[PDB]
Amino acid sequence: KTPLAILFMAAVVGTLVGLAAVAFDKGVAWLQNQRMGALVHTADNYPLLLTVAFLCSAVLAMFGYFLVRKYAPEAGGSGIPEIQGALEDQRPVRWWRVLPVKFFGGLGTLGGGMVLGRQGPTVQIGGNIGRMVLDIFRLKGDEARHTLLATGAAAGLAAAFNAPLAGILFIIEQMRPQFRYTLISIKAVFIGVIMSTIMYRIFNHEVALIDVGKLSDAPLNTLWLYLILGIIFGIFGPIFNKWVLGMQDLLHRVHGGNITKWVLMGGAIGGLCGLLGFVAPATSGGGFNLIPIATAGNFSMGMLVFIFVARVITTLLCFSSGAPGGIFAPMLALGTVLGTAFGMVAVELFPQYHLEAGTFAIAGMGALLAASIRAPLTGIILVLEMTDNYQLILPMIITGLGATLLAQFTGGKPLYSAILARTLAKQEAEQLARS
Amino acid sequence: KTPLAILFMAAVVGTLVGLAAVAFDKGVAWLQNQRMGALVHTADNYPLLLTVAFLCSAVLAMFGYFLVRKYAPEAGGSGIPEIQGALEDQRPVRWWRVLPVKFFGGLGTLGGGMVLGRQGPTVQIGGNIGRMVLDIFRLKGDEARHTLLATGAAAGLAAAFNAPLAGILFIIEQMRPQFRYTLISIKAVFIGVIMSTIMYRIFNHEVALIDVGKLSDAPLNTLWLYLILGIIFGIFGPIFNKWVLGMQDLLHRVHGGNITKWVLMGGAIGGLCGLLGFVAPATSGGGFNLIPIATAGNFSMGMLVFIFVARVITTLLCFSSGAPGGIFAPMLALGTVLGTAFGMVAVELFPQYHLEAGTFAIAGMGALLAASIRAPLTGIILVLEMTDNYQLILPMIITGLGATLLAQFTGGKPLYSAILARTLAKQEAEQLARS
Ligand SMILES: [Cl-]
Ligand SMILES: [Cl-]
Ligand SMILES: [Cl-]
Ligand SMILES: [Cl-]
Ligand SMILES: [Cl-]
Ligand SMILES: [Cl-]
């Protein structure tokens, strides 16, 4: 009866999520190209070019910050904490607000060149799309409601980075405590992921989404260095997480919850990233365009330290303000830069081992996700499906374990669970409306 | 306190399992080469060559069947149903019997050229190794006992086919209902898999374990054919499973549980496979040497039908008798042959689509595991780590879903769960010893 209705709806959800993820992607790419086109007007007067670049990114940012604070407060930030909450029945899915705001707000913020990524946006959009078709078709039952939320979210992740294996792992690993695993619920996840992936492939050439060439394999006597890399990320992960929650509390003292001040602060952050797009490209943007540049070895050791410091600052400023945008693609840039640096050192320390810094760059992306988000297998596979370097499978599991151990040992928690816990706590507290 | 003891013991288990898996592998390869060497004596008198080939495989088979029926009845068959049972507290782990019998019995049966594979042997050996070091070190606690069983089993699977990603998926997907997922229990699985994989790599060149070259990718307008392939395997999977349980009941009427008759029947089965090694190579052996031959397109359509029929017969005869040996590698051969046949038809039916039979061969391996064993993600990844054809990720998820749907719809169950259910049922029944 209703089990076959669920499996057919999953296919509908997967197709619609897929087209939304491609629209979001193509929309953000067009806006960035439109900005570079409107600045050809001031081709050889650099002062005025930087000034209108600033105001152009400030307006789009202010547009996004406005939509979130006015129509959908829960569309601020990543999206994953909110979906995670909804899979527990702890949070609503207001798709009539979150789909228009997250889409058109995320176009303004990522489109302006802010230090934000697509994962959280499209995963939340996918989940709301999943709830939308449930509410449109009037499917009744607690299983259907929960199941289509899950297939919508997985489909969002798979369509965003062309990563179907990762979209399934996002539900069976990262959302293990929330997800009610049944025979029908897991087939629906597969169907939604299959359909959303086909929609990506119709519009994009199937390739390495992060073209980093084909690196060398990792020899046996080399493998221990990936455990040391993992340990380093293990201690750094929980510190970074303390900084993104701290920076939410600190940036709140600026505006005090007031819409006008909040939007103006977003315009400054948005404007600044739009400026830094031009004067120092590697310090700004989501992170994708600089990962292959860094992994190839084009930066000096001193330059990698500068990008790392600058990026941690612009990453925290963008994400913690509560702009609609994810921290996934920023974190990949941070792990690439720190991993390449680690790689450079090891190359000079051990001339015997026949090493290459780029293998440690790719391990670094997996390591930072493992240490902060604490869903290792999902991050490791995500990075492999985007780089297509499947011979680094063992190195990355070793780095992921390193990161996972020391992150638990040094008192870290999963970033997304921590943010949801603060949202739930703050909501309980504001039942002082109840005296 | 005890959490750090568990993570250090996992490393010990992973190393020991790794060396046992390599020893088993190298032992089985040496015996097969020793048999081909002792038959050079009768190089140009073919009648006597086949006769001693028969008696040579019959003795080794009789040796294996003897060890199982005399010292460790639960070492007969795969191993996975028994481990699965132990993870539920429903079955004992008699490592003082199962390690010597499974190892030296599995050397005689797989070494004689019987239609049996290494997965079940090494997974059960790994689990017993995990319980052995728990009992040696006298670790107390229900968590430790359960956890090291799990890391031992995963490590066995990862070391047997050089498949670390698959060894983790074997516990988080295939053993989901049994496995008590905690922060410490999952890190221990990782550690055991890391260490066992290193032990494989020390003794074997890291390559494609099934060298099948680099096939073409799957174009978009082609993807629907993999769903039809999946559907076909979906209906065939539960039928095959009915035949392996049926063939256990039928082959039991031969000996009636009597040790003498049982061993003699094993010698006939063992002898026959040793003969068929020489007169018709593709009808016998575990399956690994004929998968690349079939995938390359060297067999005519008529020959693929003959191998399929012959193999289903020799696969059921070998496995269902209760010889120590797995059905995993046999099933891969069956899915390769049926998939190549399907591939050939589609190539001629659609000259427009620019297809290759070999893509459907690899999809077929995933499809038969999905339809019988019913752990799709684990099988699909296993096949990718052995063939190294990571561009067929989406085709295989589509075939796995096809297979998983129709196998549930047509009333199939997971092979391993079905065998364990019959073992538990038969044990309850023989408490008629209680009047
Ligand atoms: Cl957030
Ligand atoms: Cl993101
Ligand atoms: Cl995110
Ligand atoms: Cl069995
Ligand atoms: Cl096997
Ligand atoms: Cl098996």
Residue numbers in the entry:
A (entry chain A), B (entry chain A): 30 to 464
Pull verbatim passages from the article behind this deposition:
CLC transporter proteins are present in intracellular compartments throughout our bodies – in our hearts, brains, kidneys, livers, muscles, and guts – where they catalyze coupled exchange of chloride (Cl–) for protons (H+). Like all CLC proteins, CLC-ec1 is a homodimer in which each subunit contains an independent anion-permeation pathway. Gluex is positioned at the extracellular entryway to the Cl–-permeation pathway, where it acts both as a ‘gate’ for the transport of Cl– and as a participant in the transport of H+.
The QQQ mutant (E148Q/E203Q/E113Q) was crystallized in the lipidic cubic phase, without any antibody Fab fragment. In QQQ, this intracellular constriction is unchanged compared to WT CLC-ec1 and is narrower than that observed in the CLC-1 channel. Analogous simulation of the QQQ mutant revealed a dramatic and unanticipated result: water penetration into the hydrophobic core of the protein is greatly increased, and water pathways directly connect bulk water in the intracellular solution to Glnex, without requiring intermediate connection to Glnin. Taken together, the DEER distance distributions provide strong support for the conclusion that the QQQ structure represents a WT CLC-ec1 conformation.
